[PDB]
Structure formats: structure tokens, C-alpha cells
Write an enzyme that holds these catalytic residues in place. Structure first.
Site, PDB file in Angstrom:
ATOM      1  N   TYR A 135      20.482 -27.140  35.199  1.00  0.00           N
ATOM      2  CA  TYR A 135      21.760 -27.545  35.807  1.00  0.00           C
ATOM      3  C   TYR A 135      21.578 -27.739  37.315  1.00  0.00           C
ATOM      4  O   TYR A 135      20.990 -26.895  38.000  1.00  0.00           O
ATOM      5  CB  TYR A 135      22.787 -26.440  35.554  1.00  0.00           C
ATOM      6  CG  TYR A 135      24.165 -26.659  36.151  1.00  0.00           C
ATOM      7  CD1 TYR A 135      25.195 -27.109  35.349  1.00  0.00           C
ATOM      8  CD2 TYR A 135      24.458 -26.332  37.495  1.00  0.00           C
ATOM      9  CE1 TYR A 135      26.484 -27.306  35.838  1.00  0.00           C
ATOM     10  CE2 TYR A 135      25.750 -26.517  38.005  1.00  0.00           C
ATOM     11  CZ  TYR A 135      26.764 -26.994  37.152  1.00  0.00           C
ATOM     12  OH  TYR A 135      28.062 -27.192  37.570  1.00  0.00           O
ATOM     13  N   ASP A 172      27.418 -33.355  39.805  1.00  0.00           N
ATOM     14  CA  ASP A 172      26.616 -32.391  39.017  1.00  0.00           C
ATOM     15  C   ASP A 172      25.830 -33.117  37.954  1.00  0.00           C
ATOM     16  O   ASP A 172      26.250 -34.192  37.492  1.00  0.00           O
ATOM     17  CB  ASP A 172      27.521 -31.417  38.267  1.00  0.00           C
ATOM     18  CG  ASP A 172      28.274 -30.485  39.182  1.00  0.00           C
ATOM     19  OD1 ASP A 172      27.805 -30.192  40.291  1.00  0.00           O
ATOM     20  OD2 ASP A 172      29.315 -30.006  38.747  1.00  0.00           O
ATOM     21  N   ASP A 180      39.562 -28.050  34.657  1.00  0.00           N
ATOM     22  CA  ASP A 180      39.722 -26.617  34.818  1.00  0.00           C
ATOM     23  C   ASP A 180      40.726 -26.320  35.938  1.00  0.00           C
ATOM     24  O   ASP A 180      41.554 -27.187  36.273  1.00  0.00           O
ATOM     25  CB  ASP A 180      38.363 -25.940  35.052  1.00  0.00           C
ATOM     26  CG  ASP A 180      37.724 -26.315  36.388  1.00  0.00           C
ATOM     27  OD1 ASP A 180      36.532 -25.987  36.571  1.00  0.00           O
ATOM     28  OD2 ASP A 180      38.391 -26.906  37.261  1.00  0.00           O
ATOM     29  N   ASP A 212      36.270 -32.404  36.544  1.00  0.00           N
ATOM     30  CA  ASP A 212      34.891 -32.173  36.880  1.00  0.00           C
ATOM     31  C   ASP A 212      34.031 -33.024  35.941  1.00  0.00           C
ATOM     32  O   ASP A 212      34.325 -33.105  34.742  1.00  0.00           O
ATOM     33  CB  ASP A 212      34.562 -30.677  36.757  1.00  0.00           C
ATOM     34  CG  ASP A 212      33.349 -30.280  37.562  1.00  0.00           C
ATOM     35  OD1 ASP A 212      32.852 -31.126  38.321  1.00  0.00           O
ATOM     36  OD2 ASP A 212      32.895 -29.119  37.455  1.00  0.00           O
ATOM     37  N   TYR A 230      32.486 -20.199  29.497  1.00  0.00           N
ATOM     38  CA  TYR A 230      31.645 -19.312  30.357  1.00  0.00           C
ATOM     39  C   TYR A 230      32.472 -18.534  31.383  1.00  0.00           C
ATOM     40  O   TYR A 230      32.044 -17.443  31.810  1.00  0.00           O
ATOM     41  CB  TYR A 230      30.467 -20.043  31.039  1.00  0.00           C
ATOM     42  CG  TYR A 230      30.857 -20.921  32.220  1.00  0.00           C
ATOM     43  CD1 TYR A 230      30.297 -20.715  33.489  1.00  0.00           C
ATOM     44  CD2 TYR A 230      31.765 -21.964  32.061  1.00  0.00           C
ATOM     45  CE1 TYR A 230      30.658 -21.532  34.565  1.00  0.00           C
ATOM     46  CE2 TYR A 230      32.127 -22.795  33.123  1.00  0.00           C
ATOM     47  CZ  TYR A 230      31.565 -22.569  34.370  1.00  0.00           C
ATOM     48  OH  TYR A 230      31.923 -23.374  35.435  1.00  0.00           O
TER      49      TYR A 230
END
Lengths: 162, 160, 160, 160, 162, 162
Positions: free
Chosen positions: C43, C58, C85, C90, C127
Site C-alpha cells: 500500500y 493512493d 468514509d 477516497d 479495518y
């Protein structure tokens, strides 16, 4: 669908060559490899089989992560690596775990990426290069039908031996 | 008493081939090896040297435990591995950490066990076997005198 | 043939959430995850991009073995994960290493096994479950065309 | 509420003693330990401090999992380990990560289990036992007030 | 003080779900998890117990470092995780090693940090999320008294089964 | 040439002190060390021996890479670590694997680098420093002849015990 139990002797990534003593059930260190190579798959044998050379038929199991020596995995054959070395012929059945949809698309040797078969071949061709009086004269891959025929012969030899 | 700093690129036991970009200092993944082999020693380069091919001189460092990419280790030469591949000649200086009594018995190439030299050679001879167009045609070892002579040529080549 | 450099922040299998401080280049520990989960891919972020929120875009990189934080890998997009989120939208571009024949069969999102896409989604959906005030309201996958369009917007946004 | 950034040099569980060169920022291998011991905590230094001896103030960070060398972690002091060896006095500030509810119950030295403090002490007392000319003559723990006073002296010493 | 032997099947941090075949003693791979999760504690079972479902009572052991599959640890109960899934009720006894002063201060579930209990709960609630036809309807924690009562019932069932 | 089988209990680098229960064959966790130390070699015992204290003779095996608990390695003695602790005398035979040319040059204790012997000594002198009522009064090394004499006595005690 042919399936069977494989006992793992050597986890993928290891340079210690473990072996199960088939008389006692104990896991033994055979030797640490003399070459800078590591086992390309989990490696072991098919329970309740007997090869031409007196030991159970060897198995290579494709897995997302390595296991521990002594662990049982229920598996199905997809092909077979064949080689000729200092003790003559040696075959190793290539397997995937059963009852796992993540492997469902691999039905035979033709489904396994060539780079993976080539890496496994390279390991067995070279891993004893620095061991005097050890050699490899031939090495190739055959498919699932021929793997299953060998499995069946070894099952038959197992039963005939007692 | 020749000694120098080695930057480690690849820790012993790794199948990921990392390299330092010498124009930025960044650590990059070159490739994951196509062969089931692992680097036989910590592997990197000698700081402030310039080889015949424009990159710093490569170094192999014997250590009890592997390091991390980018780590500096002060080392001294004991010999040199030489090879010929698709790019031509390549030399890698074999080194041990300085001022560490545990390595004081290793003065030159004769002091390194043959089985260890043979394993290192085997790695470099075979690690590219499954890459089209890549090959190794010859590989050998030379002693500490030859290694120091190459380090000296590389240091001056850096200065010039 | 869109390609770019990805800096890895977090190796696959890690429960430590590292992040690069983009104003210094330092690698920082953000936090250890509060859930018994591990990053499903390597990541990080795409160098020389700027997302809608001011950070680089990302990236998730599919690799045979995990890297180290700070390592650069040249990669190509095959799809994009999108989520909503507590901070809003995102996007994370899904990538494979370039010029590596072992990934040449992966051209787009349809080529990535569903079980692997589902695992990556599950990680990002859950997560942060044990962090007060954090949540994920929606998550989905889009294909390579959409991923490249987002990369292009982010590259221009960087330039401007 | 005193807090600061710690750069980790040595991850917990390591036998390689890494150090940051403070004039370059490079991570160097100091040495592999001569004793069969492993660092009991993540180990490093507090950024923007200067100890009595010219180096930044050392820090020990309690964490659920070890980090990588060079990683920054924002931390708060709970106590301080003090020792006397061949170089004279040495202090190491004991820290926990900030803004992490899992450590909120640890306010000071009394909150850290005795068995953990004793293990950390044992490491520093013995890790150099097999190095000629090195020794540890005394080692003890002091509380958070004393730790913050030392951090403050070190911060001002940095400024001056 | 109630104490017993736990055989570890799965070390903390693993994604391979190993299981002991109670008929043979062999360690088998059940499956690799389909979710990006890892076991939150060492995981196994209490020797000489029998749950309502025919298998020994499951145990979760808090430890400073993971063990290996097959290893025995003498342990004492501090509480119990209870859940309801596709096979109905399932309980897992939470334990700490005996005769270790480092765990002396944990006498019951109230002593275990909430964030640790919540992480263990999250694992069991979610780890089968991507397995079709598997689900979790309920999950909670009870304390040492109730853990010991279940241990006693399972010891009793073990003895009654032969 | 004296040689024997060593069963490994504790891999090099570990802080978990595993032990084989000699009555059952099970591997058990004894305890996690209280000191920040790790076993300096693979550690275990010589099969078919009995020490003065009732347990098999302990063995330390020098190896390029750690093994797993329970694994057998065929080994040969090169010397012996002797110590006196809270249960009196304790000896541990230092061994190398047989039939491996990489160890051929180590015939006796004089061949083993001093820094390695000193590290192994330091471990056994200190690893129980934080365990109350445990201590070490003496520790030293003897050579291969004395190791072989102790091995022979323990083989003899094994045979006399049944």
C-alpha cells in the site's frame, strides 16, 4: 475426482530439507541445502502410496502460504514433474487443495502459469548442483491424466506391499 | 588496511532484487527473481567508487545476520568475485565488517570456506537462468590483492 | 500505456499503519490497527500526483512478496477501489509491476480474481471498525479506464 | 502534556545494533551484539534534543509490534532509565505512543509492570558483557517528572 | 483454582486455519482464511473435554509470543467468548498460562483490557464474512465463573462419553 | 566415531522454552523467558540417554539455520558445557550434524570459535537471572573426550533403567 492426503515435509521458502521417517513417523533433518535455493512449493508425500523406489509418491502442493512439517492437506492432482537423477527416475505429483473455490479454475497442468512450472523445474534441476555424485539427466512436466495414472499405480503398489 | 563504507541494497535471503537509484538515493524494486533462489550474502555497493560501467563497485558483505536496504556498514575487502554476462564484465568485492574480532581470522580469500564461495558463485551463475537474453558465461574468484587494486581503480575513477 | 512510480508505505501483511510525511519525506507510524486485520496488498501512493483532498493518489500494488516502507516500484493501473468514509471520498488505484511478464495477463479489473478483490474490499470496509467516529459507508471497484482518468486528473492537479 | 517525535534506530527483538549518523541522517550498523540478547523495546532517540554528551537523548518506546529503522513515532514520556558505563552517565527516556487509548492507563513509571522494567534493565546491564573494556556499574529507574525535566534540559541544550 | 491443558492449533498472527483431527492426533490444514484477518490469540482446545457439538471445548490463550501447532500449555480460565453461528452456539474459553507471575494480576474477564476483548470479538464476528452460507447472529463475553461452569460441563460430558 | 540422534526442543533465536514430556512424547511450553535473551543454538536432548537427574542428556546443536520443535538430527559430539545451578550439576553436549562436509573441520571443542562458546556460556549463566530462587554457581567447557565419556555413562544409565 481423484483426491488424497498429502503430508507436508518441507514448507515453501525453506532451505532445510526435512524428511519423514516412514518407519517411525518422526520428522528428521536430512540436510541443509548446499545451494542458495529455497523450496519453490510446499513439499511432501501422498499418504498410503508406494513408488517404485519403496517410498511414498512425492507431492508438491500449491498454497497461498507455507505450512509446517507434518501437517496434512487434502489435495487433488493437476500434473506431475518427472525427473531422472542418480537414483534413476523420480516423479513428484503437483497438487492443489480440494474444496477451495480459489483453486477451482486449475483443472490441469495447462492451467498452471508457465513461469511457475519453470521455477519449480529450475529448483529440482539445480538444487543438488554442489553435491558430489548427484546429477539430473532429464526433467519435464506431464498432465493430470498421467499424474492420476501414477497415483493409481502407487496406490496399487501400496496395497500389494501389505 | 583498506576499508570503506558499503551501502546494502539487498539483505541475505531475499528474492526481491532492490537497487539504489544513484541519482536520487531512492531504493527501488528492480524485480522479483524468476528463479527459486535467494541472495547468498548481503549485497550492495561501495560508497564513493565508480566501476568500469559507470555504477559504484558492487560489494558482497559476510555478516551473522542480514541488514535492511539502505544501511551503511564499514567493511574491508578479502577477495573479489568476477563474472561475464550479457552486459560484459562484472566484479563484486567480498567484504567482512571492520573492527570486529569475530572476523579477524579472515584475512583473504583462502580464509573463506570453499562451500561458501561455491554457493555465492552458484547464485550469480544461475539467478538469471529464466530471463530471456540474460546469461552468465564465466565466473571466478580472485584474492584480496586483486580486490584492493580494483577498489583503488574505482576510487580514482570516482575522483576523475 | 500509462505507468508511474509508486512509493510503498505499508507492506502486505502488516498491522502497523505507516505513512509518508509528504512535507519531509519521513516515514511515520500513524497507528497500530485496532482490528485483528492485516494490509491485503502493498500500500502506498503515486509519486507526482495530487488527489482531490491534497494528498498524493493512493495505490495498491499486487506483488509476489511484500516490500519495505519507502521503496519505489514502477507500476501500471488495472482498476480502482473507491470508498466513502468519515472524510468523504477516497480512491485507491490497483496496480501491477510493469515490464514483468508474470503480470502481462492482467490488463484490467476483470483479470483480477474476485476472491482477491473481495478480500481487499473487506479490509478497507472493516479495518477501522473499532475506531470511534470512523466508518465506511460504501465501497466499490471500477475498471482501468476509470483508474487512468483519475490518475490523469491527479497528475494535472499536481502540475497546477 | 509533554510529547515529542522519536526516531527508531533499532526494532524490538533485534541483535543488530543500528545507529543513525546525526551528521548525515544515514542508518549504520554499529555492531552485531556479542551476547545472545535482543533489544527489549524499540530503541532510538528524541528528535531536536541534545544530551549531556552531544548526541540526541535516547528513547525506549513501548509498542505492540516493532517498527523499522528510521521510522518516526510521536510519543510521551512515562519514566527514564539511567545507567553508568565506561563512557559515564547515560539516560534513556521510556515512552508510549501518544493519542492511543490503548496506552492511556500508563501515566507514569508505577504503571509499567515490574517484570518489564526488570527485563529492560537486564538487557542494558548485560548486553556488553562480552566486550573488553565495556561495563555497566549502576542502573536504575526514575519517574515521569524526572524524565520530563531531562527532556526539557536536552531541548534547551539543543537550542543553545 | 481450575487449570487444564490446552493444545494449540493455530498460533496468533496466522491466516492458516489448522485443526487437530481428534481421531488420529494429526494436525490438518482446514483452510486459509478468505478474509484479510489473522488469529488474534493462540487458538486451540482443552484436552479431555467434550462440548455439546462433539468436539473438545475451544480455548484462546493469551501469550507474549505465538507457539507452534500441537504444543501443550497448562492454562487457567479467565472468561469465555460466546457466539451463535451456522452450526448454532459456540463457546471459546479465554485462558492465561498458569504458574507465571506475569499473568497473576488477571483473575477474571474484568481484568482483561477492553480493546483486547473487542479485537478478539471482531475477529470471530468477521473472519468468515466471505464464506457463503456462514454467518454470526450473536457474540458476547462472560466471566470466569461461567467459563468454569462450561469447562466443568465439558469435563462431565467427556467422562460420560466413555 | 560416536554419533547419536538429537531431538530438538528449542530452535535457535527463540525465547519460548519448550520441553518434550518424555512420558507422552508431547511438546509442552515450559515458560517464556523472563530475560531479554534468546537460545544461542538449537537446543534439545539425546535420544536413548539418561542423565544422573532422570532426564535424557541435553544437547546443543550448531546449525546454519534453526529447526522446529520435535525434529530429529543425527549428530556427533565436539565438547560439553558443564554448569552448577539450583538443582546441582547440569551438562549439555555440544554437537554438529554428521555426514556434512561443512562441519568436517570441527573435530573438538578447540576448533569452535571462542566467541561462540562465550555467547553460549553467557546465555546459560544469565537466562534465569530474573527467576527467584534460581542461580548459577559454576559454568565451563570440556572437550570431546569428556563429552563422549558422559554420553557413554548416560547410554549405560539408560540401559540399566530398563
Amino acid at each position: 475426482m481423484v483426491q488424497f492426503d498429502v503430508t507436508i515435509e518441507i514448507p515453501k521458502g525453506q532451505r532445510n530439507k526435512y524428511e519423514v521417517d516412514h518407519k517411525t513417523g518422526r520428522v528428521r533433518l536430512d540436510r541443509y541445502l548446499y545451494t542458495p535455493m529455497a523450496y519453490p512449493t510446499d513439499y511432501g508425500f501422498i499418504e498410503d502410496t508406494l513408488g517404485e523406489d519403496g517410498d511414498p509418491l512425492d507431492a508438491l502442493v500449491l498454497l497461498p502460504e507455507p505450512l509446517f512439517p507434518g501437517v496434512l492437506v487434502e489435495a487433488r492432482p493437476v500434473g506431475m514433474f518427472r525427473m531422472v537423477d542418480e537414483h534413476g527416475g523420480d516423479d513428484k505429483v503437483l497438487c492443489v487443495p480440494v474444496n477451495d473455490h480459489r483453486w477451482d479454475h486449475i483443472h490441469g497442468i495447462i492451467d498452471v502459469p508457465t513461469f511457475e512450472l519453470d521455477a519449480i523445474k529450475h529448483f529440482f534441476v539445480h538444487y543438488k548442483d554442489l553435491e558430489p555424485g548427484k546429477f539430473v539427466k532429464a526433467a519435464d512436466w506431464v498432465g493430470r491424466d498421467e499424474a492420476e495414472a501414477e497415483v493409481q499405480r502407487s496406490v496399487e503398489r501400496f496395497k500389494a506391499g501389505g
